[PDB]
A paper describes a structure:
Receptor binding and immune escape have been recognized as two major drivers for the evolution of receptor-binding domain ([name]) of the viral spike (S) protein, which is responsible for receptor recognition. Receptor binding is a key step for [name]-[name]-2 infection. As previously reported, the binding interface of [name]-[name]-2 [name] in complex with [name] was divided into two patches.
Moreover, the crystal structures of BF.7 and BQ.1.1 [name] binding to hACE2 were also solved at resolutions of 3.46 and 3.40 Å, respectively, for detailed molecular interactions. In addition, BQ.1 is another descendant of BA.5 sub-variant, which has gained K444T, N460K mutations compared to BA.5, and has evolved into BQ.1.1 and BQ.1.1.18 by gaining R346T substitution. Though the side chain of V486 is shorter than that of F486, V486 is also a hydrophobic amino acid that can interact with the hydrophobic amino acids, L79 and M82, in the hACE2 through van der Waals force (VDW).
Residue numbers in the entry:
A (entry chain B): 333 to 527
B (entry chain A): 19 to 614
Amino acid sequence: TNLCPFDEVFNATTFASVYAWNRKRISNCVADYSVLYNFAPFFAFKCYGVSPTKLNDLCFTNVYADSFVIRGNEVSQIAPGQTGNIADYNYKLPDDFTGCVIAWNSNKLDSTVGGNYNYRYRLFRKSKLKPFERDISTEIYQAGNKPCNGVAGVNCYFPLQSYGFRPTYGVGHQPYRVVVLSFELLHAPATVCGP
Amino acid sequence: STIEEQAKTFLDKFNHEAEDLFYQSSLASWNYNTNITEENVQNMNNAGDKWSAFLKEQSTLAQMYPLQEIQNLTVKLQLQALQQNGSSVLSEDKSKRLNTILNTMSTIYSTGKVCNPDNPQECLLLEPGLNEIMANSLDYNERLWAWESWRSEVGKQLRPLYEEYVVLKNEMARANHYEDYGDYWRGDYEVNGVDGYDYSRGQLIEDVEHTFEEIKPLYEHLHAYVRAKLMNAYPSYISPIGCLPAHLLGDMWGRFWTNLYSLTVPFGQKPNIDVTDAMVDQAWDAQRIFKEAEKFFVSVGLPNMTQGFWENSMLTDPGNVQKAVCHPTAWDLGKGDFRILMCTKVTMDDFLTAHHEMGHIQYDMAYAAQPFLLRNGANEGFHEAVGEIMSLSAATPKHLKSIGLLSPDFQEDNETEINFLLKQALTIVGTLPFTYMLEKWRWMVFKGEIPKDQWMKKWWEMKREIVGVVEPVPHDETYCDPASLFHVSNDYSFIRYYTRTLYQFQFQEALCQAAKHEGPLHKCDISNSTEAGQKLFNMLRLGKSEPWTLALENVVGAKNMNVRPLLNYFEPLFTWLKDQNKNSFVGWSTDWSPYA
Ligand SMILES: *[C@@H]1O[C@H](CO)[C@@H](O[C@@H]2O[C@H](CO)[C@@H](O)[C@H](O)[C@H]2NC(C)=O)[C@H](O)[C@H]1NC(C)=O
Ligand SMILES: *[C@@H]1O[C@H](CO)[C@@H](O)[C@H](O)[C@H]1NC(C)=O
Ligand SMILES: *[C@@H]1O[C@H](CO)[C@@H](O)[C@H](O)[C@H]1NC(C)=O
Ligand SMILES: *[C@@H]1O[C@H](CO)[C@@H](O)[C@H](O)[C@H]1NC(C)=O
Ligand SMILES: *[C@@H]1O[C@H](CO)[C@@H](O)[C@H](O)[C@H]1NC(C)=O
Ligand SMILES: [Zn+2]
């Protein structure tokens, strides 16, 4: 009956850091996936399991609009069965993933000549991330054999690094605004529909 | 958790903070060089000072991961380059004397002036003063005056400094487990731990001299021919069997003979190839020059200039008020940002240089995938050889005909081929004995073989014996003639210019063969041969991750520096030189001198 707040997630004013990837739960609303184009210079629309063509057909129990920012080189990592710092430790997608991945260059919005260190990723983590897990802990990462005692130092590195986006960077080091659309499908009424 | 693993994570954190800080220093050096003001100068010092104090800090945290317990050679190289102490290993007093000396010598040279004897008000800097005399004048005493004054005013001050400079630089080297400062300088070429590709620092001296033996016949003929033509231009002054006076070689020192082409051109009636006039006719700007240059690399299968490159680069002098340093350089700021700073006029010189500097950019883009500390040429001589083989192919008649700058009706006759090869040999061949000898004299000064009371004596002894060049005025040990050259009083290794020369012809002969070029090697144009760009690329992407011996083999199929390609490129001139010297004297005498 009401339009899903695709305006909210895709427009926004700030998005997230990928380690704290921000999920909007979409339910009981009409989906109009055809509006999803903001005319961005390096737009991507890969979709797995489901078919991106005619995406306004299939109902689902929920539609999880996960949103965050990563640099262009790492955009390819937002896909089933990938590797690298983003998929390893920050935001993993499952093997049989059945949603959509929608990124777009945002150098306009998130860079700064002095450098924008607000967006973070997770450089080190003791284990690989299970699909759709989120790590937001600031546990001082122990790399050596002496305990770290919650303070950084030798072999005790803070696990979060800043991107430092500047407008003079390159295409692969520039901030891209990813939006995943995770299509859950349970035994439920599957309220998320709409032509 | 082992120590190789802790080193992995230590470098992983370093690789991300180093990339972020090195960028700010690079973009602070960029904004100064493009916009010289007294605000930019301050910040270039700032971001550099944080960077020089971040590397210095990180060096100490790295010493804790011993190399012998790291088995991944990729990790070993990063740790080894990060554990470099350098001047740090000297005391806070001696580490201060050295930087006072280096700053004093650099300023004495770059600000050195000599004032007219007839006119003690008029003075001249090295540029655009005395260097303007050395290049364009053909008077004898006008040249001798500048040559002798520059080495007796600037040189005599630098002598006591260079004596202390040698002492401290050795102490720094011996503290970092190096024989002398020269041994420290030859560590650039060293390889360890990779069987079949190892290389010791002593092997460089063996290689450099062994190859130079094969150069000697070609040089003794270029020397004898040039001497004959010079003897006809300075009749009373030049002997037919003795060395060339050092002030008649085209520059202040004799480094390059390029300026003697006016006096030595074999077939002066036939013209030089100069597409400057043709570029003007067709309405060419610097935009076109780099676009055509970008097209050349795309033809061999290399990528296009990044979308940021065109937006941010300085391809023309902004002129007017905003001043700059116009010296052409290729900037790898990192984080995907690549730029060229070039004040480009529409000539042929700047057409070839744009190909040369963009060759550096292509190398930088190729190895950008590597870790931070491994983003550099395999050794020092690699990076410049990559740029020079781009101007090699782009300057040929074949490439100029295929872009519309030379009419398909101009015909390549053997006399112009000799005209071409000589003007190449003056620059390229003539510098090899100057370069090898100069770094030989520095190597021996550091190693202790030449006493202080013999410095200038063994210099001019080797100038006569190796370079085949003689001083016009006898010099005691209060001169420092090597110090009057930039690279010597500013602490730069010079052997790279010898190795770079031999490397570039090895590449060109290996690329042109993969391009199925048939004919003399000096006619080749690697354009449109993707097989050639592939072969070059597989070395470019390595950077420092592989030993320079392996990288050289992935292009030419040989593990070590060779000279046969350089001779092969110059062979048509070689036999023509053996002809024109039929009744001249080939060789020189080491006790002739114009000063009696
Ligand atoms: C750079 O200098 C450091 C500091 O002296 C060297 O590391 C020390 O070397 C001494 C040699 O006697 C050892 O006793 C120390 O245990 C070392 N470690 C520390 C933390 O002091 C380092 O070896 C030098 N680097 C090179 C390449 O020589
Ligand atoms: C995004 O929000 C801003 C501020 O509310 C608004 O001006 C803009 O039109 C929005 N973009 C849309 C709705 O596409
Ligand atoms: C060294 O490490 C790199 C990356 O850490 C890895 O790709 C490579 O295989 C390692 N080398 C060896 C010999 O294991
Ligand atoms: C290089 O330019 C050509 C011509 O416009 C273009 O087709 C090609 O896609 C460009 N290279 C890349 C990697 O995009
Ligand atoms: C570059 O220098 C000029 C002075 O000629 C100045 O007006 C300009 O503001 C400088 N650039 C920037 C980005 O400030
Ligand atoms: Zn260069």
